[PDB]
PDB file of C-alpha atoms and ligand atoms in Angstrom:
ATOM      1  CA  UNK A   1    -167.189  13.906   0.656  1.00  0.00           C
ATOM      2  CA  UNK A   2    -164.752  15.544   3.104  1.00  0.00           C
ATOM      3  CA  UNK A   3    -165.319  19.062   4.279  1.00  0.00           C
ATOM      4  CA  UNK A   4    -162.912  21.160   2.177  1.00  0.00           C
ATOM      5  CA  UNK A   5    -161.139  24.231   3.524  1.00  0.00           C
ATOM      6  CA  UNK A   6    -159.176  26.697   1.372  1.00  0.00           C
ATOM      7  CA  UNK A   7    -156.403  28.361   3.344  1.00  0.00           C
ATOM      8  CA  UNK A   8    -154.219  31.035   1.748  1.00  0.00           C
ATOM      9  CA  UNK A   9    -150.841  32.021   3.249  1.00  0.00           C
ATOM     10  CA  UNK A  10    -149.519  35.577   2.656  1.00  0.00           C
ATOM     11  CA  UNK A  11    -146.713  37.766   3.987  1.00  0.00           C
ATOM     12  CA  UNK A  12    -143.379  39.336   3.043  1.00  0.00           C
ATOM     13  CA  UNK A  13    -140.694  37.604   1.022  1.00  0.00           C
ATOM     14  CA  UNK A  14    -138.491  35.346   3.197  1.00  0.00           C
ATOM     15  CA  UNK A  15    -140.768  35.146   6.255  1.00  0.00           C
ATOM     16  CA  UNK A  16    -140.977  31.351   5.849  1.00  0.00           C
ATOM     17  CA  UNK A  17    -144.308  30.760   4.104  1.00  0.00           C
ATOM     18  CA  UNK A  18    -143.129  27.896   1.888  1.00  0.00           C
ATOM     19  CA  UNK A  19    -141.204  26.201   4.697  1.00  0.00           C
ATOM     20  CA  UNK A  20    -144.229  26.463   6.981  1.00  0.00           C
ATOM     21  CA  UNK A  21    -146.336  24.595   4.423  1.00  0.00           C
ATOM     22  CA  UNK A  22    -143.767  21.902   3.576  1.00  0.00           C
ATOM     23  CA  UNK A  23    -142.797  21.241   7.184  1.00  0.00           C
ATOM     24  CA  UNK A  24    -146.445  21.017   8.172  1.00  0.00           C
ATOM     25  CA  UNK A  25    -147.546  18.789   5.273  1.00  0.00           C
ATOM     26  CA  UNK A  26    -144.519  16.498   4.985  1.00  0.00           C
ATOM     27  CA  UNK A  27    -143.265  16.604   8.601  1.00  0.00           C
ATOM     28  CA  UNK A  28    -139.775  17.550   7.268  1.00  0.00           C
ATOM     29  CA  UNK A  29    -138.177  20.988   6.963  1.00  0.00           C
ATOM     30  CA  UNK A  30    -136.795  21.718   3.445  1.00  0.00           C
ATOM     31  CA  UNK A  31    -133.013  21.356   3.038  1.00  0.00           C
ATOM     32  CA  UNK A  32    -131.314  22.811  -0.048  1.00  0.00           C
ATOM     33  CA  UNK A  33    -134.473  22.761  -2.180  1.00  0.00           C
ATOM     34  CA  UNK A  34    -137.212  25.243  -1.246  1.00  0.00           C
ATOM     35  CA  UNK A  35    -139.838  25.509  -3.997  1.00  0.00           C
ATOM     36  CA  UNK A  38    -146.160  28.937  -5.384  1.00  0.00           C
ATOM     37  CA  UNK A  39    -147.885  25.576  -5.108  1.00  0.00           C
ATOM     38  CA  UNK A  40    -151.087  24.264  -3.595  1.00  0.00           C
ATOM     39  CA  UNK A  41    -150.557  21.603  -0.932  1.00  0.00           C
ATOM     40  CA  UNK A  42    -153.449  19.222  -0.014  1.00  0.00           C
ATOM     41  CA  UNK A  43    -153.397  18.052   3.683  1.00  0.00           C
ATOM     42  CA  UNK A  44    -155.877  15.895   5.686  1.00  0.00           C
ATOM     43  CA  UNK A  45    -156.722  16.782   9.307  1.00  0.00           C
ATOM     44  CA  UNK A  46    -158.829  15.057  11.897  1.00  0.00           C
ATOM     45  CA  UNK A  47    -161.032  17.652  13.558  1.00  0.00           C
ATOM     46  CA  UNK A  48    -163.736  16.581  16.018  1.00  0.00           C
ATOM     47  CA  UNK A  49    -163.601  12.998  14.729  1.00  0.00           C
ATOM     48  CA  UNK A  50    -164.013  13.822  11.027  1.00  0.00           C
ATOM     49  CA  UNK A  51    -161.327  14.112   8.341  1.00  0.00           C
ATOM     50  CA  UNK A  52    -161.039  17.499   6.688  1.00  0.00           C
ATOM     51  CA  UNK A  53    -159.408  18.341   3.308  1.00  0.00           C
ATOM     52  CA  UNK A  54    -157.149  21.320   3.869  1.00  0.00           C
ATOM     53  CA  UNK A  55    -156.038  22.996   0.674  1.00  0.00           C
ATOM     54  CA  UNK A  56    -153.059  25.198   1.336  1.00  0.00           C
ATOM     55  CA  UNK A  57    -152.209  27.976  -1.111  1.00  0.00           C
ATOM     56  CA  UNK A  58    -148.702  29.396  -1.140  1.00  0.00           C
ATOM     57  CA  UNK A  59    -148.182  32.946  -2.421  1.00  0.00           C
ATOM     58  CA  UNK A  60    -145.366  35.224  -3.523  1.00  0.00           C
ATOM     59  CA  UNK A  61    -144.680  38.069  -1.119  1.00  0.00           C
ATOM     60  CA  UNK A  62    -142.975  40.388  -3.609  1.00  0.00           C
ATOM     61  CA  UNK A  63    -144.422  43.606  -5.094  1.00  0.00           C
ATOM     62  CA  UNK A  64    -144.121  42.184  -8.617  1.00  0.00           C
ATOM     63  CA  UNK A  65    -147.110  39.953  -7.850  1.00  0.00           C
ATOM     64  CA  UNK A  66    -149.344  42.702  -6.430  1.00  0.00           C
ATOM     65  CA  UNK A  67    -151.817  42.305  -9.367  1.00  0.00           C
ATOM     66  CA  UNK A  68    -151.469  38.498  -9.797  1.00  0.00           C
ATOM     67  CA  UNK A  69    -151.526  37.258  -6.190  1.00  0.00           C
ATOM     68  CA  UNK A  70    -155.140  38.311  -5.421  1.00  0.00           C
ATOM     69  CA  UNK A  71    -156.335  36.058  -8.265  1.00  0.00           C
ATOM     70  CA  UNK A  72    -155.877  33.187  -5.792  1.00  0.00           C
ATOM     71  CA  UNK A  73    -158.109  34.811  -3.153  1.00  0.00           C
ATOM     72  CA  UNK A  74    -161.657  34.015  -4.288  1.00  0.00           C
ATOM     73  CA  UNK A  75    -163.379  31.213  -2.312  1.00  0.00           C
ATOM     74  CA  UNK A  76    -160.779  31.461   0.475  1.00  0.00           C
ATOM     75  CA  UNK A  77    -162.084  30.192   3.812  1.00  0.00           C
ATOM     76  CA  UNK A  78    -159.269  31.496   5.999  1.00  0.00           C
ATOM     77  CA  UNK A  79    -156.071  33.536   5.572  1.00  0.00           C
ATOM     78  CA  UNK A  80    -152.795  33.203   7.433  1.00  0.00           C
ATOM     79  CA  UNK A  81    -150.849  36.466   7.465  1.00  0.00           C
ATOM     80  CA  UNK A  82    -147.235  35.616   8.296  1.00  0.00           C
ATOM     81  CA  UNK A  83    -144.354  37.731   9.558  1.00  0.00           C
ATOM     82  CA  UNK A  84    -140.943  36.672  10.919  1.00  0.00           C
ATOM     83  CA  UNK A  85    -140.500  37.189  14.675  1.00  0.00           C
ATOM     84  CA  UNK A  86    -136.959  38.312  13.859  1.00  0.00           C
ATOM     85  CA  UNK A  87    -137.868  40.795  11.105  1.00  0.00           C
ATOM     86  CA  UNK A  88    -139.626  43.890  12.489  1.00  0.00           C
ATOM     87  CA  UNK A  89    -139.995  45.188   8.895  1.00  0.00           C
ATOM     88  CA  UNK A  90    -142.098  42.083   8.045  1.00  0.00           C
ATOM     89  CA  UNK A  91    -144.182  42.732  11.165  1.00  0.00           C
ATOM     90  CA  UNK A  92    -144.879  46.389  10.193  1.00  0.00           C
ATOM     91  CA  UNK A  93    -145.903  45.195   6.749  1.00  0.00           C
ATOM     92  CA  UNK A  94    -148.704  43.109   8.320  1.00  0.00           C
ATOM     93  CA  UNK A  95    -150.576  46.359   9.041  1.00  0.00           C
ATOM     94  CA  UNK A  96    -149.189  48.375   6.122  1.00  0.00           C
ATOM     95  CA  UNK A  97    -149.664  45.856   3.307  1.00  0.00           C
ATOM     96  CA  UNK A  98    -151.087  42.419   4.063  1.00  0.00           C
ATOM     97  CA  UNK A  99    -154.085  43.240   6.187  1.00  0.00           C
ATOM     98  CA  UNK A 100    -155.382  45.955   3.766  1.00  0.00           C
ATOM     99  CA  UNK A 101    -154.759  43.720   0.708  1.00  0.00           C
ATOM    100  CA  UNK A 102    -156.609  40.744   2.103  1.00  0.00           C
ATOM    101  CA  UNK A 103    -159.502  42.886   3.320  1.00  0.00           C
ATOM    102  CA  UNK A 104    -159.785  44.753  -0.009  1.00  0.00           C
ATOM    103  CA  UNK A 105    -160.587  41.445  -1.729  1.00  0.00           C
ATOM    104  CA  UNK A 106    -162.143  39.485   1.166  1.00  0.00           C
ATOM    105  CA  UNK A 107    -163.762  41.783   3.752  1.00  0.00           C
ATOM    106  CA  UNK A 108    -165.149  38.966   5.929  1.00  0.00           C
ATOM    107  CA  UNK A 109    -162.755  36.039   5.708  1.00  0.00           C
ATOM    108  CA  UNK A 110    -161.118  35.136   9.013  1.00  0.00           C
ATOM    109  CA  UNK A 111    -157.427  36.031   9.364  1.00  0.00           C
ATOM    110  CA  UNK A 112    -154.985  34.312  11.686  1.00  0.00           C
ATOM    111  CA  UNK A 113    -151.731  36.179  12.407  1.00  0.00           C
ATOM    112  CA  UNK A 114    -148.710  33.873  12.466  1.00  0.00           C
ATOM    113  CA  UNK A 115    -145.286  34.767  13.820  1.00  0.00           C
ATOM    114  CA  UNK A 116    -142.668  32.535  12.181  1.00  0.00           C
ATOM    115  CA  UNK A 117    -139.055  31.549  12.973  1.00  0.00           C
ATOM    116  CA  UNK A 118    -139.835  31.190  16.705  1.00  0.00           C
ATOM    117  CA  UNK A 119    -136.590  29.198  17.047  1.00  0.00           C
ATOM    118  CA  UNK A 120    -134.611  32.352  16.309  1.00  0.00           C
ATOM    119  CA  UNK A 121    -136.225  34.710  18.849  1.00  0.00           C
ATOM    120  CA  UNK A 122    -133.754  33.942  21.652  1.00  0.00           C
ATOM    121  CA  UNK A 123    -130.819  33.206  19.369  1.00  0.00           C
ATOM    122  CA  UNK A 124    -127.845  35.342  20.435  1.00  0.00           C
ATOM    123  CA  UNK A 125    -126.499  36.123  16.946  1.00  0.00           C
ATOM    124  CA  UNK A 126    -129.997  37.185  15.867  1.00  0.00           C
ATOM    125  CA  UNK A 127    -130.557  39.398  18.925  1.00  0.00           C
ATOM    126  CA  UNK A 128    -127.185  41.049  18.365  1.00  0.00           C
ATOM    127  CA  UNK A 129    -127.851  41.514  14.633  1.00  0.00           C
ATOM    128  CA  UNK A 130    -131.121  43.260  15.381  1.00  0.00           C
ATOM    129  CA  UNK A 131    -129.583  45.339  18.229  1.00  0.00           C
ATOM    130  CA  UNK A 132    -127.145  46.784  15.702  1.00  0.00           C
ATOM    131  CA  UNK A 133    -130.118  48.272  13.848  1.00  0.00           C
ATOM    132  CA  UNK A 134    -131.659  49.477  17.137  1.00  0.00           C
ATOM    133  CA  UNK A 135    -134.252  46.680  16.930  1.00  0.00           C
ATOM    134  CA  UNK A 136    -135.309  43.592  18.864  1.00  0.00           C
ATOM    135  CA  UNK A 137    -137.238  40.375  18.101  1.00  0.00           C
ATOM    136  CA  UNK A 138    -141.034  40.770  18.137  1.00  0.00           C
ATOM    137  CA  UNK A 139    -142.421  39.701  21.524  1.00  0.00           C
ATOM    138  CA  UNK A 140    -145.606  37.773  22.176  1.00  0.00           C
ATOM    139  CA  UNK A 141    -147.416  40.861  23.629  1.00  0.00           C
ATOM    140  CA  UNK A 142    -146.464  42.893  20.556  1.00  0.00           C
ATOM    141  CA  UNK A 143    -147.657  40.205  18.163  1.00  0.00           C
ATOM    142  CA  UNK A 144    -150.906  39.889  20.138  1.00  0.00           C
ATOM    143  CA  UNK A 145    -151.450  43.663  19.961  1.00  0.00           C
ATOM    144  CA  UNK A 146    -151.015  43.560  16.173  1.00  0.00           C
ATOM    145  CA  UNK A 147    -153.447  40.678  15.972  1.00  0.00           C
ATOM    146  CA  UNK A 148    -156.114  42.706  17.799  1.00  0.00           C
ATOM    147  CA  UNK A 149    -155.428  45.790  15.717  1.00  0.00           C
ATOM    148  CA  UNK A 150    -156.096  43.862  12.456  1.00  0.00           C
ATOM    149  CA  UNK A 151    -159.159  42.002  13.735  1.00  0.00           C
ATOM    150  CA  UNK A 152    -157.392  38.635  13.577  1.00  0.00           C
ATOM    151  CA  UNK A 153    -159.263  35.715  15.182  1.00  0.00           C
ATOM    152  CA  UNK A 154    -156.086  34.186  16.610  1.00  0.00           C
ATOM    153  CA  UNK A 155    -152.437  34.987  17.087  1.00  0.00           C
ATOM    154  CA  UNK A 156    -149.985  32.050  16.819  1.00  0.00           C
ATOM    155  CA  UNK A 157    -146.181  31.650  16.918  1.00  0.00           C
ATOM    156  CA  UNK A 158    -144.359  28.734  15.353  1.00  0.00           C
ATOM    157  CA  UNK A 159    -141.117  27.345  13.949  1.00  0.00           C
ATOM    158  CA  UNK A 160    -141.190  25.385  10.692  1.00  0.00           C
ATOM    159  CA  UNK A 161    -137.606  24.314  11.546  1.00  0.00           C
ATOM    160  CA  UNK A 162    -138.270  22.694  14.940  1.00  0.00           C
ATOM    161  CA  UNK A 163    -142.030  22.284  14.234  1.00  0.00           C
ATOM    162  CA  UNK A 164    -142.947  23.831  17.538  1.00  0.00           C
ATOM    163  CA  UNK A 165    -146.464  25.204  17.279  1.00  0.00           C
ATOM    164  CA  UNK A 166    -146.905  24.160  13.670  1.00  0.00           C
ATOM    165  CA  UNK A 167    -149.888  21.791  13.873  1.00  0.00           C
ATOM    166  CA  UNK A 168    -151.685  24.317  16.102  1.00  0.00           C
ATOM    167  CA  UNK A 169    -151.523  26.939  13.355  1.00  0.00           C
ATOM    168  CA  UNK A 170    -153.508  24.825  10.912  1.00  0.00           C
ATOM    169  CA  UNK A 171    -155.814  23.323  13.584  1.00  0.00           C
ATOM    170  CA  UNK A 172    -156.806  26.869  14.596  1.00  0.00           C
ATOM    171  CA  UNK A 173    -157.126  27.849  10.925  1.00  0.00           C
ATOM    172  CA  UNK A 174    -159.699  25.045  10.496  1.00  0.00           C
ATOM    173  CA  UNK A 175    -161.595  25.906  13.674  1.00  0.00           C
ATOM    174  CA  UNK A 176    -161.891  29.564  12.603  1.00  0.00           C
ATOM    175  CA  UNK A 177    -163.885  28.236   9.647  1.00  0.00           C
ATOM    176  CA  UNK A 178    -165.721  25.284  11.217  1.00  0.00           C
ATOM    177  CA  UNK A 179    -165.901  26.211  14.915  1.00  0.00           C
TER     178      UNK A 179
HETATM  179  N1  GNP B 201    -134.431  29.369  11.557  1.00  0.00           N
HETATM  180  C1  GNP B 201    -135.509  29.258  10.738  1.00  0.00           C
HETATM  181  N2  GNP B 201    -135.399  29.552   9.443  1.00  0.00           N
HETATM  182  C2  GNP B 201    -136.554  29.374   8.758  1.00  0.00           C
HETATM  183  C3  GNP B 201    -137.769  28.944   9.253  1.00  0.00           C
HETATM  184  N3  GNP B 201    -138.723  28.891   8.239  1.00  0.00           N
HETATM  185  C4  GNP B 201    -138.067  29.285   7.170  1.00  0.00           C
HETATM  186  N4  GNP B 201    -136.767  29.611   7.410  1.00  0.00           N
HETATM  187  C5  GNP B 201    -135.788  30.082   6.424  1.00  0.00           C
HETATM  188  O1  GNP B 201    -136.231  31.313   5.927  1.00  0.00           O
HETATM  189  C6  GNP B 201    -135.886  31.460   4.525  1.00  0.00           C
HETATM  190  C7  GNP B 201    -137.135  31.734   3.732  1.00  0.00           C
HETATM  191  O2  GNP B 201    -138.072  30.641   3.797  1.00  0.00           O
HETATM  192  P1  GNP B 201    -139.201  30.549   2.696  1.00  0.00           P
HETATM  193  O3  GNP B 201    -140.079  29.425   3.132  1.00  0.00           O
HETATM  194  O4  GNP B 201    -138.553  30.321   1.385  1.00  0.00           O
HETATM  195  O5  GNP B 201    -139.915  31.944   2.721  1.00  0.00           O
HETATM  196  P2  GNP B 201    -141.029  32.507   1.819  1.00  0.00           P
HETATM  197  O6  GNP B 201    -141.909  33.249   2.750  1.00  0.00           O
HETATM  198  O7  GNP B 201    -141.643  31.431   1.057  1.00  0.00           O
HETATM  199  N5  GNP B 201    -140.399  33.522   0.706  1.00  0.00           N
HETATM  200  P3  GNP B 201    -141.143  33.944  -0.720  1.00  0.00           P
HETATM  201  O8  GNP B 201    -142.278  35.003  -0.733  1.00  0.00           O
HETATM  202  O9  GNP B 201    -140.016  34.619  -1.475  1.00  0.00           O
HETATM  203  O10 GNP B 201    -141.463  32.723  -1.569  1.00  0.00           O
HETATM  204  C8  GNP B 201    -135.116  30.195   4.176  1.00  0.00           C
HETATM  205  O11 GNP B 201    -133.731  30.402   4.390  1.00  0.00           O
HETATM  206  C9  GNP B 201    -135.665  29.202   5.192  1.00  0.00           C
HETATM  207  O12 GNP B 201    -134.763  28.167   5.465  1.00  0.00           O
HETATM  208  C10 GNP B 201    -137.874  28.629  10.630  1.00  0.00           C
HETATM  209  O13 GNP B 201    -138.869  28.223  11.234  1.00  0.00           O
HETATM  210  N6  GNP B 201    -136.679  28.818  11.319  1.00  0.00           N
HETATM  211 CL1   CL B 202    -156.443  38.072  18.640  1.00  0.00          CL
HETATM  212 MG1   MG B 203    -142.063  30.837  -0.802  1.00  0.00          MG
END
């Protein structure tokens, strides 16, 4: 049967984990309804179809004992932060990287910056400037990726779908080659 790949997506509340999965799998960004489900996608990689199982997770502290129950048999993790939330970025090193590695010392991690569409949005830049902050830049995201031993750093927008297929393609190749 098809090569199966278990991919688990983690990161702070509101970084866009669920939208990333729905936009990727259905080719449509959620409207009013945003639903921690498992999505099943099929991907053609080097001429063979692959069964990508995608596991959504809750980012909140209340699930700190329950969430890791989904981790066994994971083939690759995506650690997500919003490019327009520096707090979510800091939490990659402070929370997500240590949690994943505590349970899965060897599983490849891809770092994904989300909400790419908002990085040069004026209202967003101004909002962040008021708190003495700025959107996370590509060099900064890449530096965090190296620091956490990630195999790849990617940026995407679930809303426009820019970079979205590449995230999951690279996820698969980190497992398969
Ligand atoms: N502009 C923009 N907004 C986005 C994008 N992806 C998600 N959002 C918005 O960000 C918010 C959170 O998205 P969501 O997918 O629910 O995040 P989450 O990471 O699943 N949160 P949780 O841990 O609570 O379940 C929603 O308002 C959603 O519309 C994106 O690419 N661009
Ligand atoms: Cl890297
Ligand atoms: Mg969600």
